[PDB]
């Protein structure tokens, strides 16, 4: 959770002069949050929360200085606030909060001196999220298209397409019985960082399976370690089903 730009924004409308800026975190109607995408001057692409709500005034003489817009990231408890500062119906919009893929947010509006709604951002498999800067940093553009072939002597041959980075990969084999989810075997295979010559080429690893009847469901997972996502890159898997 962050602001796209931190300078004060002009939010003025006919009959209402308005400024909005980040503030220290201290009635609104029709609070709505849409997912939008912002392209930056630096050439990046971020998912943003497009937040809107209505201020309805009546004949009532009232002291109204502004509004506080609060966004809480539920996984980290990161909270950011912006304060609207004033001078029948006015619709307010704020689209400068950058959000993270696959995260839930709680949005709150308070008139100063309330309404709360939650917002869930789709993961990096969503076609529009896939091309954002955060998703591409998680390796969203790489498609290994992992395939696992059963070999004659209780071995598997795993094939996968490498990306274009000189970083290592790991293949994690976890074996299971047909239905029970307690593993009967586990093995990690280190794939050395490829040379630029093997970039975008399809490589393979041969895995040796545990010789145990019933230990027949083999999950094979590839984890890349691209410099932009370290231990947090998107992973892919294929599973060999039991021939039972
Ligand atoms: C990925 O694997 C599937 C296997 O059925 C195949 O249809 C598809 O064409 C493969 N993709 C590429 C890029 O070769
Ligand atoms: C990696 O491959 C993609 C293929 O679309 C390309 O856009 C990108 O520029 C390549 N990155 C590097 C560092 O060569
Ligand atoms: C066992 O693993 C499968 C994985 O697809 C899952 O659907 C199922 O709910 C799991 N069951 C238990 C008891 O963990
Ligand atoms: C498996 O991959 C290695 C490169 O990592 C290659 O030398 C070998 O020939 C490939 N094996 C098969 C069966 O294609």
Curated annotation (Swiss-Prot):
Any one GO molecular-function label of the UniProt entry: signaling receptor binding
Translocase among keywords: no
Keyword Phosphoprotein tagged: yes
Keywords noted in UniProt: Adaptive immunity, Cell membrane, Disulfide bond, Glycoprotein, Host-virus interaction, Immunity, Inflammatory response, Innate immunity, Membrane, Phosphoprotein, Receptor, Secreted, Signal, Transmembrane, Transmembrane helix
Known partners and oligomeric status: Forms heterodimers with IL17RC; the heterodimer binds IL17A and IL17F homodimers as well as the heterodimer formed by IL17A and IL17F. Forms complexes with 2:1 binding stoichiometry: two receptor chains for one interleukin molecule. IL17A homodimer preferentially drives the formation of IL17RA-IL17RC heterodimeric receptor complex, whereas IL17F homodimer forms predominantly complexes with IL17RC homodimer.
Organism of this sequence: Homo sapiens (Human)
Positions in the Extracellular compartment: 1-244
Residues bearing attached sugar chains per UniProt: 17, 22, 145, 164, 181, 204
Section of the entire sequence shown: 33 to 305 of 866
Domain of life: Eukaryota
GO terms (BP aspect): cell surface receptor signaling pathway; defense response to fungus; fibroblast activation; granulocyte chemotaxis; inflammatory response; innate immune response; interleukin-17-mediated signaling pathway; interleukin-17A-mediated signaling pathway
Disulfide linkage: 11-18, 25-81, 124-135, 184-215, 216-242, 229-233
Disease: Immunodeficiency 51: A primary immunodeficiency disorder with altered immune responses and impaired clearance of fungal infections, selective against Candida. It is characterized by persistent and/or recurrent infections of the skin, nails and mucous membranes caused by organisms of the genus Candida, mainly Candida albicans.
Name of the featured protein: Interleukin-17 receptor A
PTM statement from Swiss-Prot or TrEMBL: Glycosylated.
Tissue localization of expression: Widely expressed.
GO cellular component: a single term: plasma membrane
Role noted for this protein: Receptor for IL17A and IL17F, major effector cytokines of innate and adaptive immune system involved in antimicrobial host defense and maintenance of tissue integrity. Receptor for IL17A. Receptor for IL17F. Binds to IL17A with higher affinity than to IL17F. Binds IL17A and IL17F homodimers as part of a heterodimeric complex with IL17RC. Also binds heterodimers formed by IL17A and IL17F as part of a heterodimeric complex with IL17RC.
């Amino acid at each position: 959770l962050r602001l796209l730009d931190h300078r004060a924004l002009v939010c003025s409308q006919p009959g209402l002069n308005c400024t909005v800026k980040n503030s220290t975190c201290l009635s609104p109607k029709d609070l709505q949050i849409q997912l939008h995408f912002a392209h930056t001057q630096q050439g990046d692409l971020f998912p943003v929360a497009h937040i809107e709500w209505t201020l309805q005034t009546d004949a009532s003489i009232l002291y109204l200085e502004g509004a506080e817009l609060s966004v809480l990231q539920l996984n980290t408890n990161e909270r950011l606030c912006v304060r609207f500062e004033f001078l029948r119906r006015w619709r307010f919009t704020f689209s400068h909060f950058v959000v993270d893929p696959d995260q839930e947010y709680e949005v709150t509006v308070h008139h100063l001196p309330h309404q709360s709604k939650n917002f869930l951002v789709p993961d990096c498999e969503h076609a529009r999220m896939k091309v954002t800067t955060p998703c591409m940093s998680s390796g969203s553009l790489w498609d290994p298209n992992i395939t696992v072939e059963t070999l004659e002597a209780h071995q598997l041959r795993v094939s996968f397409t490498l990306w274009n980075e000189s970083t290592h990969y790991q293949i994690l084999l976890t074996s299971f019985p047909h239905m029970e989810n307690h593993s009967c075997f586990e093995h990690m295979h280190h794939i050395p960082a490829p040379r630029p010559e093997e970039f975008h080429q399809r490589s393979n690893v041969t895995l040796t399976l545990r010789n145990l009847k019933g230990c027949c469901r083999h999950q094979v997972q590839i984890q890349p370690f691209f410099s932009s996502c370290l231990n947090d890159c998107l992973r892919h898997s294929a599973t060999v089903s039991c021939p039972e």
